[PDB]
Each structure stands twice: as structure tokens, then as C-alpha cells.
Design a protein around this motif. Structure first.
Motif, PDB file in Angstrom:
ATOM      1  N   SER A 260       0.851  -1.221   0.000  1.00 16.85           N
ATOM      2  CA  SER A 260       0.000   0.000   0.000  1.00 16.85           C
ATOM      3  C   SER A 260       0.876   1.258   0.000  1.00 16.85           C
ATOM      4  CB  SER A 260      -0.811  -0.086   1.291  1.00 16.85           C
ATOM      5  OG  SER A 260       0.078  -0.158   2.399  1.00 16.85           O
ATOM      6  N   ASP A 261       1.607   1.479  -1.064  1.00 18.03           N
ATOM      7  CA  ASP A 261       2.482   2.693  -1.164  1.00 18.03           C
ATOM      8  C   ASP A 261       3.206   2.984   0.157  1.00 18.03           C
ATOM      9  OD1 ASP A 261       3.497   5.030  -2.023  1.00 18.03           O
ATOM     10  OD2 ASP A 261       1.669   5.705  -2.942  1.00 18.03           O
ATOM     11  N   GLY A 262       3.945   2.039   0.677  1.00 11.52           N
ATOM     12  CA  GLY A 262       4.670   2.293   1.956  1.00 11.52           C
ATOM     13  C   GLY A 262       4.874   0.981   2.719  1.00 11.52           C
ATOM     14  N   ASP A 263       5.521   0.021   2.114  1.00  8.37           N
ATOM     15  CA  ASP A 263       5.759  -1.273   2.816  1.00  8.37           C
ATOM     16  C   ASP A 263       6.652  -2.183   1.964  1.00  8.37           C
ATOM     17  OD1 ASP A 263       3.143  -1.452   1.038  1.00  8.37           O
ATOM     18  OD2 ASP A 263       3.984  -3.424   1.253  1.00  8.37           O
ATOM     19  N   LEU A 264       6.855  -3.399   2.392  1.00  8.72           N
ATOM     20  CA  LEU A 264       7.714  -4.330   1.604  1.00  8.72           C
ATOM     21  C   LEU A 264       7.038  -5.700   1.490  1.00  8.72           C
ATOM     22  CD1 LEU A 264       9.756  -6.739   1.792  1.00  8.72           C
ATOM     23  CD2 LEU A 264      10.107  -4.870   0.159  1.00  8.72           C
ATOM     24  N   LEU A 265       6.654  -6.077   0.301  1.00 13.65           N
ATOM     25  CA  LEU A 265       5.976  -7.394   0.106  1.00 13.65           C
ATOM     26  C   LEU A 265       6.996  -8.535   0.108  1.00 13.65           C
ATOM     27  CD1 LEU A 265       3.359  -8.043  -2.628  1.00 13.65           C
ATOM     28  CD2 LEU A 265       4.840  -9.726  -1.522  1.00 13.65           C
ATOM     29  N   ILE A 266       6.630  -9.671   0.639  1.00  9.51           N
ATOM     30  CA  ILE A 266       7.574 -10.821   0.657  1.00  9.51           C
ATOM     31  C   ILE A 266       6.843 -12.084   0.185  1.00  9.51           C
ATOM     32  CG2 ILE A 266       8.650 -12.304   2.394  1.00  9.51           C
ATOM     33  CD1 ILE A 266      10.310 -10.064   1.592  1.00  9.51           C
ATOM     34  N   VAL A 267       6.997 -12.434  -1.062  1.00  5.62           N
ATOM     35  CA  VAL A 267       6.315 -13.651  -1.592  1.00  5.62           C
ATOM     36  C   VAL A 267       7.319 -14.801  -1.705  1.00  5.62           C
ATOM     37  CG1 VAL A 267       6.947 -12.926  -3.920  1.00  5.62           C
ATOM     38  CG2 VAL A 267       4.931 -14.354  -3.557  1.00  5.62           C
ATOM     39  N   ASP A 268       6.864 -16.022  -1.649  1.00 12.99           N
ATOM     40  CA  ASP A 268       7.814 -17.168  -1.754  1.00 12.99           C
ATOM     41  C   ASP A 268       7.636 -17.886  -3.091  1.00 12.99           C
ATOM     42  OD1 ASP A 268       7.825 -16.208   0.766  1.00 12.99           O
ATOM     43  OD2 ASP A 268       8.020 -18.141   1.695  1.00 12.99           O
ATOM     44  N   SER A 269       8.466 -17.584  -4.053  1.00 12.18           N
ATOM     45  CA  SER A 269       8.346 -18.258  -5.377  1.00 12.18           C
ATOM     46  C   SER A 269       9.027 -19.627  -5.326  1.00 12.18           C
ATOM     47  CB  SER A 269       9.064 -17.335  -6.357  1.00 12.18           C
ATOM     48  OG  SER A 269      10.464 -17.391  -6.118  1.00 12.18           O
ATOM     49  N   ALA A 270       8.260 -20.674  -5.195  1.00 12.30           N
ATOM     50  CA  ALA A 270       8.860 -22.036  -5.131  1.00 12.30           C
ATOM     51  C   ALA A 270       7.758 -23.098  -5.097  1.00 12.30           C
ATOM     52  CB  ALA A 270       9.651 -22.051  -3.823  1.00 12.30           C
ATOM     53  N   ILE A 271       6.792 -22.933  -4.234  1.00 13.46           N
ATOM     54  CA  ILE A 271       5.691 -23.937  -4.146  1.00 13.46           C
ATOM     55  C   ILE A 271       4.465 -23.454  -4.924  1.00 13.46           C
ATOM     56  CG2 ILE A 271       4.284 -25.106  -2.448  1.00 13.46           C
ATOM     57  CD1 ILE A 271       6.503 -23.917  -0.439  1.00 13.46           C
ATOM     58  N   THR A 272       3.508 -24.317  -5.130  1.00 16.95           N
ATOM     59  CA  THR A 272       2.281 -23.912  -5.872  1.00 16.95           C
ATOM     60  C   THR A 272       1.132 -23.676  -4.888  1.00 16.95           C
ATOM     61  OG1 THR A 272       3.168 -25.556  -7.393  1.00 16.95           O
ATOM     62  CG2 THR A 272       0.993 -24.640  -7.885  1.00 16.95           C
ATOM     63  N   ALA A 273       0.726 -22.449  -4.717  1.00 13.28           N
ATOM     64  CA  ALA A 273      -0.384 -22.155  -3.765  1.00 13.28           C
ATOM     65  C   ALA A 273      -1.665 -22.870  -4.199  1.00 13.28           C
ATOM     66  CB  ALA A 273      -0.567 -20.640  -3.831  1.00 13.28           C
ATOM     67  N   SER A 274      -2.801 -22.345  -3.828  1.00 13.44           N
ATOM     68  CA  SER A 274      -4.083 -22.991  -4.219  1.00 13.44           C
ATOM     69  C   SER A 274      -5.141 -21.919  -4.466  1.00 13.44           C
ATOM     70  CB  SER A 274      -4.470 -23.862  -3.026  1.00 13.44           C
ATOM     71  OG  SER A 274      -3.914 -25.160  -3.190  1.00 13.44           O
ATOM     72  N   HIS A 275      -6.079 -22.184  -5.328  1.00 14.97           N
ATOM     73  CA  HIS A 275      -7.132 -21.171  -5.603  1.00 14.97           C
ATOM     74  C   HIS A 275      -7.812 -20.744  -4.309  1.00 14.97           C
ATOM     75  CE1 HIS A 275      -6.057 -22.026  -9.505  1.00 14.97           C
ATOM     76  NE2 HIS A 275      -6.639 -23.217  -9.666  1.00 14.97           N
ATOM     77  N   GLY A 276      -8.214 -19.514  -4.246  1.00  8.93           N
ATOM     78  CA  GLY A 276      -8.889 -19.007  -3.018  1.00  8.93           C
ATOM     79  C   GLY A 276      -7.832 -18.641  -1.974  1.00  8.93           C
ATOM     80  N   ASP A 277      -6.713 -18.133  -2.408  1.00 11.23           N
ATOM     81  CA  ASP A 277      -5.641 -17.750  -1.450  1.00 11.23           C
ATOM     82  C   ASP A 277      -4.877 -16.541  -1.992  1.00 11.23           C
ATOM     83  OD1 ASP A 277      -5.413 -20.196   0.537  1.00 11.23           O
ATOM     84  OD2 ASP A 277      -6.087 -20.903  -1.383  1.00 11.23           O
ATOM     85  N   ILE A 278      -4.392 -15.696  -1.128  1.00 16.79           N
ATOM     86  CA  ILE A 278      -3.647 -14.501  -1.604  1.00 16.79           C
ATOM     87  C   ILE A 278      -2.287 -14.921  -2.159  1.00 16.79           C
ATOM     88  CG2 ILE A 278      -2.755 -14.417   0.726  1.00 16.79           C
ATOM     89  CD1 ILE A 278      -2.528 -11.496   0.527  1.00 16.79           C
ATOM     90  N   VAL A 279      -2.240 -15.273  -3.413  1.00 16.85           N
ATOM     91  CA  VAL A 279      -0.953 -15.706  -4.025  1.00 16.85           C
ATOM     92  C   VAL A 279      -0.657 -14.880  -5.278  1.00 16.85           C
ATOM     93  CG1 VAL A 279      -1.512 -17.965  -3.126  1.00 16.85           C
ATOM     94  CG2 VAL A 279      -2.336 -17.276  -5.382  1.00 16.85           C
ATOM     95  N   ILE A 280       0.545 -14.953  -5.778  1.00 10.68           N
ATOM     96  CA  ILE A 280       0.888 -14.172  -6.999  1.00 10.68           C
ATOM     97  C   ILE A 280       0.638 -15.014  -8.253  1.00 10.68           C
ATOM     98  CG2 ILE A 280       3.198 -15.134  -6.859  1.00 10.68           C
ATOM     99  CD1 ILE A 280       2.801 -11.491  -7.593  1.00 10.68           C
ATOM    100  N   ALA A 281      -0.148 -14.517  -9.169  1.00  7.36           N
ATOM    101  CA  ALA A 281      -0.427 -15.290 -10.412  1.00  7.36           C
ATOM    102  C   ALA A 281       0.621 -14.957 -11.476  1.00  7.36           C
ATOM    103  CB  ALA A 281      -1.815 -14.833 -10.861  1.00  7.36           C
ATOM    104  N   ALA A 282       0.874 -15.862 -12.380  1.00  4.44           N
ATOM    105  CA  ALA A 282       1.892 -15.591 -13.434  1.00  4.44           C
ATOM    106  C   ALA A 282       1.434 -16.144 -14.785  1.00  4.44           C
ATOM    107  CB  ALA A 282       3.152 -16.318 -12.959  1.00  4.44           C
TER     108      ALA A 282
END
Lengths: 115, 115
Positions: free
Chosen positions: B43-65
Motif C-alpha cells: 500500500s504505497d509504503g511497505d515491503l511485500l515478501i512472496v515465496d516463489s517455489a511452491i504452488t499455492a491454491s485457488h482461493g488464497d492470496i498468491v501471486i499469479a503468473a
């Protein structure tokens, strides 16, 4: 040996130390598994990130240190020596007679694991 | 020879990589300076930390590609291809015809800088 290599993307990099922080070695952190400093962000399920290196200022969420103590809380020591817990037991109380009460770092980044 | 749970409030070693994460090299992060994926925490003032390695699941806050795209939001692709921005411009809309829509990591730890 490719017909026309345009880019070599086989191994990237990740500067976590500079990612959440930005110093060679002057930051402190603590796992939040209870409820004594939620004021900082540790609410039994997160990761606190404090920076032990600079001197914060009274009236700010910083970690205080005395005789080997450590607690995140906005406290004032210039006017008088008083601390105020915010996790849940809010109660402004004095600590000692101006003996040794000073913050160790200058911030407390709360990492809320959101998956 | 001391089978103890933990009891530790100090760490001269600064293992930031293991501090916020815990992998040799399988995590992604991005600076939050706008308002297109606040759903993840940027939100214009923070640091996001995502883990690119495992496959999340639908219905979850994950990054799509897809085709080199990067978006954070709870999307479903098994029943039907549907995306839903949550930052602020919520708009349930389909993506493509089951071409290539899959998450890259499996989480998004939001680091709220609180000083």
C-alpha cells in the motif's frame, strides 16, 4: 552452444539482508509467540524486525534496554523515567531512578505472514 | 545435552534470509509504491515478501503468473479461469481460455514498517 543466445537467465539473486533491512549488521529481530509486546507487532503469529543501531526517541514504538532487558513500547525518559506497555496491560509506570533506561534500536517492522 | 523447547532472546548472527524466510533461494519480494496489489499488502509504503517455489491454491492470496505477468489476488483456475483484483478496483473478470494461468509462489508476507 545455442543458435542465438540473447540472455543468460539460469541463477538470479536475493538480498534478503537488504530486502527487509539495509545495513551490514545492525538489526535485531524476534519471533512473536505470546502477547507481551504486541505493541510492536508480535501477536503470537508473526515476525518482529527491530533495527539495533540508532537511538530512537521518546514517544515512539522502540525497544527499551536496561540491565539486559528488551521490550517494545513508546516510553519517555527525558521528562521522567516511565514506560507504558501496549500489548494489552496499558499502565504508565515508572522504572527506576534514571539509572539506565535507553532504547537499543530505532524501529520495529512487523512482518504479518499473509498466505 | 539439554532437550529444551527454545528459551532464547538473543542472536549475534544475522540470518535475515532465514529470519523472514527459510529457503536457500526460492523467495520473491517487491517494493510497494503504488496501489495495484494492496490485496497482497503493498500500500504505497511497505515491503511485500512472496515465496516463489511452491504452488499455492485457488482461493488464497498468491501471486499469479502468465506470459510473464505478476499479480497478487485470490483467483480460481480449476473450475474456470477467473481473476479478482482486491487492491481497490475489484472487478471479477475471466483471464483467457485456460492458456497459462498459474501462481508462482505460495505466500505474501507483508512487512509493515512501524517506527
Amino acid at each position: 552452444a545455442f543458435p542465438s543466445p540473447a540472455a543468460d537467465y539460469v541463477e538470479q539473486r536475493i538480498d534478503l539482508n537488504q530486502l527487509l533491512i539495509q545495513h551490514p549488521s545492525a538489526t535485531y529481530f524476534v519471533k512473536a509467540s505470546g502477547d507481551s509486546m504486541i505493541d510492536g507487532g508480535i501477536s503470537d503469529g508473526d515476525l518482529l524486525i527491530v533495527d539495533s543501531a540508532i537511538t530512537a526517541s521518546h514517544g515512539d514504538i522502540v525497544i527499551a534496554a536496561v540491565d539486559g532487558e528488551f521490550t517494545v513500547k513508546k516510553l519517555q525518559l527525558r521528562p521522567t523515567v516511565q514506560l507504558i506497555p501496549m500489548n494489552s496491560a496499558y499502565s504508565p509506570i515508572t522504572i527506576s531512578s534514571e539509572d539506565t533506561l535507553d532504547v537499543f534500536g530505532v524501529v520495529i517492522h512487523v512482518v504479518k505472514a499473509m498466505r
